[PDB]
Amino acid sequence: ALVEDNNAVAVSFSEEQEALVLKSWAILKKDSANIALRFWLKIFEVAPSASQMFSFLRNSDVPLEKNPKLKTHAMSVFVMTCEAAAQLRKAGKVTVRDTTLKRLGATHLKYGVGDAHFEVVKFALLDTIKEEVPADMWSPAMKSAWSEAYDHLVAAIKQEMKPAE
Amino acid sequence: ALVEDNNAVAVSFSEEQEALVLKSWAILKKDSANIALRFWLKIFEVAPSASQMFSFLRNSDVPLEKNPKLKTHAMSVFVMTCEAAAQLRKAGKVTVRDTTLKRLGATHLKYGVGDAHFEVVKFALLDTIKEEVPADMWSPAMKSAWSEAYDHLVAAIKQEMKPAE
Ligand code: HEM
Numbered sequence: 001a002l003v004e005d006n007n008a009v010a011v012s013f014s015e016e017q018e019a020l021v022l023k024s025w026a027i028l029k030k031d032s033a034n035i036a037l038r039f040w041l042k043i044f045e046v047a048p049s050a051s052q053m054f055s056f057l058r059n060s061d062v063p064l065e066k067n068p069k070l071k072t073h074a075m076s077v078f079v080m081t082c083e084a085a086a087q088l089r090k091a092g093k094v095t096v097r098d099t100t101l102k103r104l105g106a107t108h109l110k111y112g113v114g115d116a117h118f119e120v121v122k123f124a125l126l127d128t129i130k131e132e133v134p135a136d137m138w139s140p141a142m143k144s145a146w147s148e149a150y151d152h153l154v155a156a157i158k159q160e161m162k163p164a165e
Numbered sequence: 166a167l168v169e170d171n172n173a174v175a176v177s178f179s180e181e182q183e184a185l186v187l188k189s190w191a192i193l194k195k196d197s198a199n200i201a202l203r204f205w206l207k208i209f210e211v212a213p214s215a216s217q218m219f220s221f222l223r224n225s226d227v228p229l230e231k232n233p234k235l236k237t238h239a240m241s242v243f244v245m246t247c248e249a250a251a252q253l254r255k256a257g258k259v260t261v262r263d264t265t266l267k268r269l270g271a272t273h274l275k276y277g278v279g280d281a282h283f284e285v286v287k288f289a290l291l292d293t294i295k296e297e298v299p300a301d302m303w304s305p306a307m308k309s310a311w312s313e314a315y316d317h318l319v320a321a322i323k324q325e326m327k328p329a330e
């Protein structure tokens with residue numbers, strides 16, 4: 001089927017699917033400061049207006065945009081997506097805490113984050129892993145793993161953005 | 166563009182710029198069907214939710230290659246965007262008949278097109294072209310002539326998506 005999210009319906013996310021999303025994260029982990037610049041400059045590239053939801057460039061003294069509410073948020077996508085994949089395999093579904101997902105719902109709704117923003121971030125997510133990881137650990141199998149993860153994350157948050165069920 | 170913009174937008178567009186657009190548009194024409202098919206597939210990769218605004222009942226044409234709505238729309242983005250090149254150059258403004266620009270805004274406003282979809286189409290526009298023309302012919306200027314034309318043709322449709330103000 002093609003529903004918003006599998007709340008209780010059969011999602012097999014194999015031990016191997018999860019293995020790819022962890023290992024590769026671990027590689028990017030090491031070069032976290034740099035990749036998160038290239039990840040954001042890839043988003044700013046596709047949809048420069050997306051990077052209006054934070055603020056113009058002021059920290060260390062350059063229009064590079066070394067601001068901390070980005071480096072931190074870049075890490076939330078990537079860490080929160082790894083915690084998604086990790087979840088899918090054990091339970092079959094995204095079960096983040098109610099405070100945290102209630103919280104993300106209202107943040108994203110307040111800042112106008114639409115459907116088109118979630119997908120240009122996943123584009124850039126995938127692209128930055130493709131790009132950073134060796135061409136030899138990267139496969140289609142690994143893009144779907146992170147796709148699935150992200151896809152089910154964004155779906156739990158988007159249901160926090162509209163009224164009752 | 167902005168160097169002092171109010172109601173006379175400083176539209177500097179050289180003949181050389183229009184010359185880059187048109188030469189790279191000759192190439193795309195020697196295989197329009199297949200290139201128009203790699204354009205909407207680049208946008209559906211970046212923003213799924215985008216091609217799901219053509220989505221499918223009247224024509225019953227579930228696949229992508231199937232609906233004419235996309236091939237035709239790939240054409241006009243490219244054709245129209247090539248025409249704003251010619252206009253900028255020759256007039257220093259998009260001179261699309263006022264009626265067509267008002268129909269164009271009433272159509273995209275009606276369909277939930279924001280800045281993110283206009284930019285994503287431009288990113289794919291520019292990846293398409295980069296991918297079709299010979300690595301020799303492509304130059305950041307050629308990329309830059311096509312960004313200009315598109316940006317100021319979108320600014321024209323946008324003006325008719327917003328109050329008079
Ligand atoms: C599903 C993927 C994403 C995750 C896991 C995520 C996570 C977070 C988290 C944890 C926060 C912290 C702020 C708070 O909790 O009050 C946040 C803030 C925010 N997010 Fe996301 N986010 C995601 C995708 C996106 C996307 C696609 C956009 C748009 C490009 C976006 C735009 C924002 C904005 C504007 C803020 C507020 C930060 C500020 O202004 O200082 N997020 N996000």
Ligand code: HEM
Nearest residue numbers: 215218219241242245268269272276278282283286318319
């Ligand atoms: C400046 C670039 C673009 C050009 C030149 C263009 C041109 C047009 C034209 C001429 C139409 C046909 C209806 C009419 O106006 O009589 C149309 C339809 C449409 N456009 Fe665009 N467009 C552009 C960008 C976009 C973008 C960026 C989106 C969003 C992904 C979009 C989404 C649509 C949709 C959903 C329709 C309706 C199709 C139909 O009614 O048959 N357009 N556009």
